[PDB]
């Protein structure tokens, strides 16, 4: 309910969610695929926290909650289907396109050129492209709880 509280959550996500780009390479994973669409949910919720971060007090822009609520939920819907697409994959082994990027700094944060659901074996402790459902539940569940 203060600059610190908001900045912690904005930091924790910018940090926790940016780490996403780390290890990607040695993992022998690389392809975000649908994930780029989902990466968006991070700046959606982080956007709100970092924009509302101005101070969760004097500034009435509290709207930060709804946009935080929206992006946290929007993240769950897109991540959930992604989880389902593994514990339940579809008949279209083929990939989409067979039936707003670019930016002065670097396109890196987003990418899709590589391949489809193929070898992907992860083997890292307990996967990770699905742990994200719980993590977004946390932001959403923090968000619902503060505005109930």
């Amino acid at each position, epitope marked *: 309910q203060g600059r610190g509280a908001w900045l912690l959550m904005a930091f924790t996500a910018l940090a926790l969610e940016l780490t996403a780009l780390w290890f990607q390479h040695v993992m022998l994973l690389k392809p975000s695929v649908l994930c780029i669409y989902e990466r968006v949910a991070l700046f959606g919720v982080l956007g709100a926290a970092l924009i509302g971060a101005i101070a969760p007090k004097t500034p009435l822009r509290y709207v930060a909650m709804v946009i935080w609520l929206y992006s946290a939920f929007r993240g769950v819907q897109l991540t959930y289907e992604h989880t389902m697409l593994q*514990l*339940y994959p579809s*008949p*279209f*082994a*083929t990939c989409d396109f067979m*039936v707003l990027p670019l930016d002065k700094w670097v396109p890196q944060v987003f990418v899709a050129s590589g391949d489809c659901a193929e*070898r*992907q074996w992860d083997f890292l402790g307990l996967e990770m492209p699905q742990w994200l459902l719980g993590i977004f539940i946390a932001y959403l569940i923090v968000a619902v709880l503060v505005v109930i």
Partner: antibody, heavy 115, light 112 residues
């Protein structure tokens, strides 16, 4: 408990057209996906179309892709198959199925193509 | 596409026996992630819509008597019906759902 009754189709001429509707009744319609299976006169079984839960994506075998159109309307709980440029190959019985693996099948509308 | 092909066309059996017809697919049906064999068996009674019988390859469906069993893995599936009741007159169809939907030709289990 859960029902499907497709209907609305008999004879149609080559190059012809005709639209069938599966009247769905007794399950959370807008939540499942829907499919359209036909069965040839040889008793053969071809899958024909697939629409996603929220009408979003559709899919077809190349053998009807272009000529066939799997719409739905969860307002009036109906599934639809809109057949166009009708080949006399299309001549078959037409089941409307439910997946989660077709677990509740209809009963068929026979459709024949002839002159 | 994938081609499903069952043998034989027909089976006779005296009411109460074990029968194991076979479904073979042109393409392996295994995922790397989970042994998940993406084949189904549908039974279809004379002049009836097919009924779901076994999915994934092993797992039976709500109200399937234990007697129908699904073995198989890779390109090689087998359906097995012990204690053939009279109300088991049918053609048994295998379907792949690994890449689009294809069906076998069918196996007619006619009674003695």
């Amino acid at each position: 408990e859960v029902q499907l009754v497709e209907s609305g189709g008999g004879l149609v001429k080559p190059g012809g057209s005709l639209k069938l509707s599966c009247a769905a009744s007794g399950f959370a319609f807008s939540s499942y996906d829907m499919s359209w299976v036909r069965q040839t006169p040889e008793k053969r079984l071809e899958w024909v179309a697939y629409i996603s839960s929220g009408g979003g994506s559709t899919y077809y075998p190349d053998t009807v892709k272009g000529r066939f159109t799997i719409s739905r309307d969860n307002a009036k709980n109906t599934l639809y198959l809109q057949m166009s440029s009708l080949k006399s190959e299309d001549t078959a019985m037409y089941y409307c199925a439910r997946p989660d693996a077709m677990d509740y099948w209809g009963q068929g509308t026979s459709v024949t193509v002839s002159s | 596409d994938i081609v499903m092909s069952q043998s034989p066309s027909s089976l006779a059996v005296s009411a109460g026996e074990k029968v194991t017809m076979s479904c073979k697919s042109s393409q392996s049906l295994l995922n790397s992630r989970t042994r998940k064999n993406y084949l189904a068996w549908y039974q279809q009674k004379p002049g009836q819509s097919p009924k779901l019988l076994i999915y994934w390859a092993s797992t039976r469906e709500s109200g399937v008597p234990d007697r129908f069993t699904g073995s198989g893995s890779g390109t090689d599936f087998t359906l097995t019906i012990s204690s053939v009741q009279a109300e088991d007159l049918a053609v048994y169809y295998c379907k792949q759902s690994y890449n689009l939907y294809t069906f076998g030709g069918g196996t007619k289990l006619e009674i003695k």
